């Protein structure tokens, strides 16, 4: 039966989850809740029958595991080294990349971290020169994790910065072509 | 002839300008520029023939003055006290309201200022109990200034907070019904 995601469609943490659900072809509903089993009262929340989860990354990994197939294996947990590189780049996204983007997005879309971001992008350029995707020659949760914040960065007048890092630009365009990513990009709008 | 706004449609500072341009029925174009006459290299920028402006509030006041009519007088500059209350509430928006909203928007849509915002909303509730709009019994630039950040607040799970302040809720619904506001709300999406 269908699973439910609770939170705003355009939130970076909700988009992470909805992107995983689209990649694995799961049936799901997104429910817009107002703050008036989930002990910190956090959003996004996720229901799968009697299971209630929170923490966007934990919810995402549950989706990627539950719906895993031979053709859609985005954690690589049966290959120790591939799974390690998925985990490394998932943590680079959390600790290094999203913090380099986030204040440029905030500044620009709701009134000089550029030099820090250029240093990050140099490393990404080098990695994506050697490999198709961040964890190796396969798409993974590491790449998907980069979608939501980068999508908002691409709405700012700093979007063209990626043109100085041609392998990063090509990797970004590759993720943007994925049908699941296109579907979720379209959902990332305020409610109407 | 048409005027040009340079910047991202969904930016709060661009939406301020585009809302003014819609309210006065001006012909205009929005141009998405990348950072690669305007001495700080700021966005939004605004061109009207040979005139180049920057600073979203200055651009907005220029639009409201240039296109002013008897029926669309949103600064009230011919009435000293009305113009004063427009200015007071424009500065309340900048100094008190947008700072109470902004970190709730940031937190929620890109990972406890609620109690400060509730104190602000108490004052708004009292003001909008006495008057239809913030500056008096007429819509003004003071009200329009509240649209962009509040629109993003209304995408968060804290949207229902306004239900505790029924005059503020009704004032917000009134602005949301304005045809110009509906038009600009629809534009506040990432580029496709």
Question: Quick summary of this structure?
Answer:
The PDB classes it as transferase. 2 copies of one chain form a homodimer. Chain A has 192 residues and is an alpha+beta fold.
Describe this structure as you would to a colleague.
The structure is a homodimer of 192-residue chains. Chain A is 54% helix and 8% strand. In chain A, strand 3 and strand 4 form a beta hairpin. By secondary structure, chain A is an alpha+beta fold. A 4-stranded mixed β-sheet of chain A has the order 2-1-3-4, with helices on one face. Chain A has 2 domains: 3-72, Glutaredoxin, CATH 3.40.30.10; 80-182, Glutathione S-transferase Yfyf (Class Pi), Chain A, domain 2. In chain A, helix 3 (80-109) packs antiparallel against helix 4 (114-130) and helix 3 (80-109) runs parallel beside helix 6. Chain A has 8 helices and 4 strands; from the N terminus they run βαβββααααααα. The two termini of chain A are 27 Å apart. Chain A has helices at residues 12-24, 56-66, 80-109, 114-130, 141-145, 147-153, 166-177, 179-187, and strands spanning 3-6, 28-31, 45-48, 51-54. The A-B interface holds A 7-8, 10-13, 32-36, 43, 56, 102, 105-106, 108-111, 149, 151-152, 154-160, 185-186, 188-192 and B 7-8, 10-13, 32-36, 43, 56, 102, 105-106, 108-111, 149, 151-152, 154-160, 185-186, 188-192. Chains A, B: This is glutathione transferase. Chains A, B: Residues 1-71 form the GST N-terminal domain. Chains A, B: The modification Cysteine sulfenic acid (-SOH) is found at residue 108.
């Amino acid at each position: 039966a269908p699973v439910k995601v609770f939170g705003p469609a355009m939130s970076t943490n909700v988009a992470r989850v909805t992107l995983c659900l689209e990649e694995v072809g799961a049936e799901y509903e997104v429910v817009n809740i107002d703050f008036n089993r989930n002990p910190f009262g956090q959003i996004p929340a996720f229901q799968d029958g009697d299971l209630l989860l929170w923490e966007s990354r934990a919810i995402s990994k549950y989706v990627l595991r539950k719906y895993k197939t031979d053709e859609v294996d985005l954690l690589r947990e049966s290959n120790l080294e591939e799974a390690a590189m998925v985990d490394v780049w998932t943590e680079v996204d959390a600790h290094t990349y999203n913090p380099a983007l986030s204040p440029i997005v905030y500044q620009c879309l709701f009134n000089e971290s550029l030099e820090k971001l250029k240093k990050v992008l140099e490393v990404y350029e080098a990695r994506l020169s050697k490999h198709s995707y961040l964890a190796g020659d396969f798409v993974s949760f590491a790449d998907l994790n980069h979608f939501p914040y980068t999508f908002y960065f691409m709405a700012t007048p700093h979007a063209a910065l990626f043109d100085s890092y041609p392998h990063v630009k090509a990797w970004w365009d590759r993720l943007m072509a994925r049908p699941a990513v296109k579907k979720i990009a379209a959902t990332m709008v305020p409610p109407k």
